[PDB]
Amino acid sequence: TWLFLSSCNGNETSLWDCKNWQWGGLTCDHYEEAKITCSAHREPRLVGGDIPCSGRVEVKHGDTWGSICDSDFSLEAASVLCRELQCGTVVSILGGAHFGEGNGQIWAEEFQCEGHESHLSLCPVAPRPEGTCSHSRDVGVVCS
Amino acid sequence: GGGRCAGRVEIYHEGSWGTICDDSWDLSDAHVVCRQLGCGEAINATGSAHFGEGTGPIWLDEMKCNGKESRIWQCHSHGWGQQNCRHKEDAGVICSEFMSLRLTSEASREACAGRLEVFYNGAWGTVGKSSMSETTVGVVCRQLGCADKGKINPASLDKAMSIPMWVDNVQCPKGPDTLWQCPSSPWEKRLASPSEETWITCDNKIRLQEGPTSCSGRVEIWHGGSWGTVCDDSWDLDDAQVVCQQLGCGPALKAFKEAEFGQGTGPIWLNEVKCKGNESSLWDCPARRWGHSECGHKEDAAVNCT
Amino acid sequence: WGHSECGHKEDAAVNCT
Numbered sequence: 001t002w003l004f005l006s007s008c009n010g011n012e013t014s015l016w017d018c019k020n021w022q023w024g025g026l027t028c029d030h031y032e033e034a035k036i037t038c039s040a041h042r043e044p045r046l047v048g049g050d051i052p053c054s055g056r057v058e059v060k061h062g063d064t065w066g067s068i069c070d071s072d073f074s075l076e077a078a079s080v081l082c083r084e085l086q087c088g089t090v091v092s093i094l095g096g097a098h099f100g101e102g103n104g105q106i107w108a109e110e111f112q113c114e115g116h117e118s119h120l121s122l123c124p125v126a127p128r129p130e131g132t133c134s135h136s137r138d139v140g141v142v143c144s
Numbered sequence: 145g146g147g148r149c150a151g152r153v154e155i156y157h158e159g160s161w162g163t164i165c166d167d168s169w170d171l172s173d174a175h176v177v178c179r180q181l182g183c184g185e186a187i188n189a190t191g192s193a194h195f196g197e198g199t200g201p202i203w204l205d206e207m208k209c210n211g212k213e214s215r216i217w218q219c220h221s222h223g224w225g226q227q228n229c230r231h232k233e234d235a236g237v238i239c240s241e242f243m244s245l246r247l248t249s250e251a252s253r254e255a256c257a258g259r260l261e262v263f264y265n266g267a268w269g270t271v272g273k274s275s276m277s278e279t280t281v282g283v284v285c286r287q288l289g290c291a292d293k294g295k296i297n298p299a300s301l302d303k304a305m306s307i308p309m310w311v312d313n314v315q316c317p318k319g320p321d322t323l324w325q326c327p328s329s330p331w332e333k334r335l336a337s338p339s340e341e342t343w344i345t346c347d348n349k350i351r352l353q354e355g356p357t358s359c360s361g362r363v364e365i366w367h368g369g370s371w372g373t374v375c376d377d378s379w380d381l382d383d384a385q386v387v388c389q390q391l392g393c394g395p396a397l398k399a400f401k402e403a404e405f406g407q408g409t410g411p412i413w414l415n416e417v418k419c420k421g422n423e424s425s426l427w428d429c430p431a432r433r434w435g436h437s438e439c440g441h442k443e444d445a446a447v448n449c450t
Numbered sequence: 451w452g453h454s455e456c457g458h459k460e461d462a463a464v465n466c467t
C-alpha cells in the first residue's frame with residue numbers, strides 16, 4: 001500500500017494538510033522508496049568553550065545528544081561542522097577533553113566526509129572498529 | 145592468482161561482483177573460502193591487495209568465521225556492505241593445492257636450466273626422473289616460457305643433499321600446456337636420491353640458422369613462444385660479439401647485414417640493438433620494445449664467429 | 451601533507467630502547 005501526493009504548497013502544518021493525497025489503489029511503478037534526511041537528523045553544537053565557535057562538539061542524533069570521540073572526528077568533518085554552524089573555517093581540533101568531559105552517551109560512529117558537504121547528515125557514517133571510547137578523549141573544535 | 149585456487153576473493157551479490165576487506169582476514173576465513181571453492185585447506189591468507197586492487201564494492205569486513213561454515217556469507221560479519229575499508233585492503237587466499245613450477249639453479253643466472261621443483265601444499269620439492277620424456281621437458285619449457293624443447297641433463301654426482309620429492313612417473317601427451325594435466329604417481333613425500341632428481345636444460349633462447357658452421361648464421365631468438373629475428377639497425381661488431389659469447393663461440397669476426405644468409409621468419413623481436421659487448425645476454429642490451437620493429441626480414445642480422 | 455588514504459587503523463607506532 002502506497003500513498004501518492006499530487007502536490008502541496010509546502011506551507012502546510014501537516015502532511016494531511018497537503019491536498020489530493022492518494023492512499024493505495026494505483027499500481028506503483030519501479031521507482032519506489034523515497035527517503036528524507038532532515039536537518040535535525042544530526043545537529044552539532046559547541047558546548048563549554050569561551051566563544052560560541054569553540055567548544056566540545058555535541059551532536060543530537062534522534063532526540064539524544066551525544067559526544068563524538070576524538071578518534072572519530074576528522075579535519076574534514078570539523079570543516080563541515082564549522083561551515084554548518086556558520087563558524088567559518090576550522091582553526092584547531094583538540095583531543096583529550098581539552099574543554100572538559102561530556103556526559104552520557106558517546107557516539108561510536110566515524111564521519112567519512114569529503115569536506116564539501118553542507119551538513120554532517122549527508123556525510124557517510126562507518127561503524128567504530130572494536131573499542132570503548134571514554135569521555136576523557138571527547139573531541140573539541142575551534143573555528144575561525 | 146595464476147590458478148583457480150589463489151587470488152583476490154570476489155563475491156557475487158544482487159547481480160554485481162564485490163570484494164572483501166583484509167581487516168580480521170585470518171586463516172580460518174581463508175579456510176572457509178577455500179572449502180567453498182573445493183580448494184582444500186588454506187595454506188596462506190594474503191592481505192594488502194597481494195594480488196592487486198579490485199573494483200566495485202567491498203562486500204564483507206571484520207570476518208569472524210568459526211571455520212565450520214559451508215559458505216563465507218554464513219560467517220558472522222558486520223553485515224552486507226557495512227565496511228570502512230578501501231580496495232587497497234582487499235583480501236586474498238592461497239590454498240595447498242595451488243601448484244607452481246620452477247627451475248632452480250645454484251650456478252647460473254640461466255632461468256631456463258636447473259633442477260625442476262614444484263610448489264605444492266606449501267613446499268617446494270623435486271620431480272622424479274622416472275618415465276620423464278623429452279616431450280614432458282618440452283611441456284615444462286613452454287609452460288615456463290623458456291622454449292619449445294629441452295634436454296634432461298645427467299645429475300651432478302657431487303651433491304650430497306637429499307631433497308623432498310613430490311611426484312614421479314610424469315607422462316605428458318602431446319597437447320597439454322601444463323604438467324598438471326599429465327598423469328603421474330600420487331602425491332608422496334619421499335627423500336630423493338641425488339640421481340633421481342630431474343635436472344633439465346631448455347635449449348638456448350638464441351640460435352644461428354643457415355650458416356656454414358654452428359658459429360655462423362642468422363641470429364634467431366626465442367620469445368613469446370616463437371622464434372624471431374633481429375633487425376640490422378645499429379647492428380655492429382659489439383652486438384655480434386655478445387651473440388657469439390652466449391653461444392660460447394669465440395670472438396666475433398664479422399657482423400653481417402641484409403639477410404646475407406637468407407631471410408628469417410616470424411616476428412622481428414628486436415630492433416636497434418645497442419650492446420656494449422660486455423653483457424651476459426642479448427636480452428640485457430638496450431633495445432626498442434620487444435616485438436616492435438619497422439624492419440622487414442630483408443634486414444635480418446647475421447654473425448660470423450671464430 | 452594531509453593527503454592520506456589511510457584510516458586510523460593504520461596509525462604507526464614505535465618501540466625503541
Ligand SMILES: *[C@@H]1O[C@H](CO)[C@@H](O)[C@H](O)[C@H]1NC(C)=O
Pocket residue numbers: 188189
Ligand atoms: C605466505 O606467502 C609468502 C609468499 O612468499 C610465503 O613466503 C610465506 O611463507 C607464506 N606464509 C607462510 C605462513 O608460510
Ligand SMILES: *[C@@H]1O[C@H](CO)[C@@H](O)[C@H](O)[C@H]1NC(C)=O
Pocket residue numbers: 397398448449450
Ligand atoms: C668468416 O666468413 C668467411 C666467409 O664469409 C668464412 O669462410 C670463414 O670461415 C669465417 N671466418 C673464419 C675465421 O672461419
Ligand SMILES: *[C@@H]1O[C@H](CO)[C@@H](O)[C@H](O)[C@H]1NC(C)=O
Pocket residue numbers: 465467
Ligand atoms: C616493546 O614493547 C613491549 C610490548 O609491546 C614492551 O613490553 C617492551 O618493554 C618493549 N621492549 C622492551 C625491550 O622493553
